[PDB]
């Protein structure tokens, strides 16, 4: 006799001209299983922030004091609409570019670039606010200093810093917008103020805005923050006459590569993979999937389908 036979299994497939044929021992190339746990990439372990944002972490939110330092990482995990964020209303200039750059940093370290004792003619103690409390008493940030009049005045500030290290730095500072004319005299005697910051490739001048605004978190004032990067020989120069939030700590980076942020709330795990989805981790060998489009790393393609089954089988 002739022919080949089989009597086992049940897997029906469809073709371009027929739509239901029983295929024996078929196989699939569609990824639809996953472990619902957040795990580790190729060596470098992710950065996990529980209830803080990037701006709150970098600037030293009092409620997020646990994240003192982390050596190095690959990407970032952050919940949707984190509760803490900035305690004082305001904004951070070029927030998205900073978040793009902070991903995939291969060296991170805190150093004291301007000590607290280098302000002999100013006041650095009574700069606390009631919108950033701590254990039932008012407080403020940790990496920045709000400077106000010491005796009765506010002398012009001319400070410079030379980058003698062998690595780049990330420096942050800010400005304050008041409520009316009578508020400024209580903090900075001078009525008309400015800031001026200059580096080799930077040039900037600012001035505050005074007006009436609504109430957010019990305050009608605002704050604006900025950032820059300097090179192993550059020097940064500051000049202020008022409304200055001077820096205390800077950061050291090496900046090789780029990545993105992840928004999810899944639990941590111990795995090794190449790509990660906001719902779980996948060790992928098939070239297609339908789990979730947004991804970090090398991942198979998105098809929006459930029935990719071809393999082989007689009859």
């Amino acid at each position, epitope marked *: 006799c002739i022919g080949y036979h089989a009597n086992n299994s049940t897997e029906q497939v469809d073709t371009i001209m027929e739509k239901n044929v029983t295929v024996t021992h078929a196989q699939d190339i569609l990824e639809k299983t996953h472990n619902g746990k957040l795990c580790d990439l190729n060596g470098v372990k992710p950065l996990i922030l529980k209830d803080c944002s990037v701006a709150g972490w970098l600037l030293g939110n009092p409620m997020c004091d646990e994240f003192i330092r982390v050596p190095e990482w690959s990407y970032i995990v952050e919940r949707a609409n984190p509760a803490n964020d900035l305690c004082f209303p305001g904004s951070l200039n070029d927030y998205e570019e900073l978040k793009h750059m902070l991903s995939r940093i291969n060296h991170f370290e805190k150093i004291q670039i301007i000590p607290k004792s280098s302000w002999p003619n100013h*006041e650095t*103690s*009574l*700069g*606390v*606010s*009631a*919108a950033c*409390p701590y254990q*039932g*008493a*008012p407080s403020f940030f940790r990496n920045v200093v709000w400077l*106000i009049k010491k*005796n*009765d005045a506010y002398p012009t500030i001319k400070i410079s810093y030379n980058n003698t290290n062998r690595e780049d730095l990330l420096i942050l500072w800010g400005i304050h917008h008041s409520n009316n004319a009578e508020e400024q005299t*209580n*903090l900075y005697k001078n009525p008309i103020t400015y800031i001026s910051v200059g580096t080799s490739t930077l040039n900037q001048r600012l001035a505050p805005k005074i007006a009436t605004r609504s*109430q957010v*978190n*019990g*305050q009608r004032g605002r704050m604006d923050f900025f950032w820059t990067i300097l090179k192993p020989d550059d020097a940064i120069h500051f000049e202020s006459n008022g409304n200055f939030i001077a820096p205390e700590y800077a950061y050291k980076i090496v900046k090789k590569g780029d990545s993105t942020i992840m928004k999810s709330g899944v639990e941590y795990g111990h795995c090794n993979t190449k790509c990660q989805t906001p719902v779980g981790a996948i060790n992928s060998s098939m070239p297609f999937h339908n789990i979730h489009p947004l991804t970090i790393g090398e991942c198979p393609k998105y098809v929006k389908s459930n029935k990719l089954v071809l393999a082989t089988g007689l009859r």
Partner: antibody
Amino acid sequence: QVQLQESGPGLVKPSETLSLTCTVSGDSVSSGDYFWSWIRQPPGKGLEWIGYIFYGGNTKYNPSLKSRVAISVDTSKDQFSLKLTSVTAADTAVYYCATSYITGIQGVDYWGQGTLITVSS
Amino acid sequence: EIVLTQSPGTLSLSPGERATLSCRASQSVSSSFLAWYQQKPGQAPKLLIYGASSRATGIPDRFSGSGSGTDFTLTISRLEPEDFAVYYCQQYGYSLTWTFGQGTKVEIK
């Protein structure tokens, strides 16, 4: 700018409580930049501290009158009131209303006007 | 409990001279967290000097002050007809111990 006015009852029998009110005109009581406090002054003696409340629900108390003290606030009629309990003979106090800045704190500058309270049977 | 004691008990002066009212302490307090007041009968005590030595808006040029560490002083420079009242020290801060003093008075010679 803020102005204050307190009024309040004068005579209370012993072992009962004590209640005052303090109205705020101008800036709202939901300001979030002030220290609404209470300060007593026994006649013939000096001053002393009782406690304050600021934005939120955060309060602090003096460790002399601690069990028998409570300060509460409301936003409808713009008032904050005090409820002293377990009154004794040595609880006569001309209760004040005081305000202070929280950022760049200076000395207390805006005070009320005074009201006399006497406790007896 | 930070207790503040005011060294002078009572000062009688003729117009023209200066007062040397002082204010000791038990534990060393800072210089940015101390103020002075002025109490007239009835209404309230008001603000005279905030900080170690810095006048308040409206205060005349006569009233000065000095001191640091644990030994603060004050001065009225010139005695004028108006000035006769009772003054109080304060230890405002974030140490949860806002304690005043026992006061001091000045009257006619």
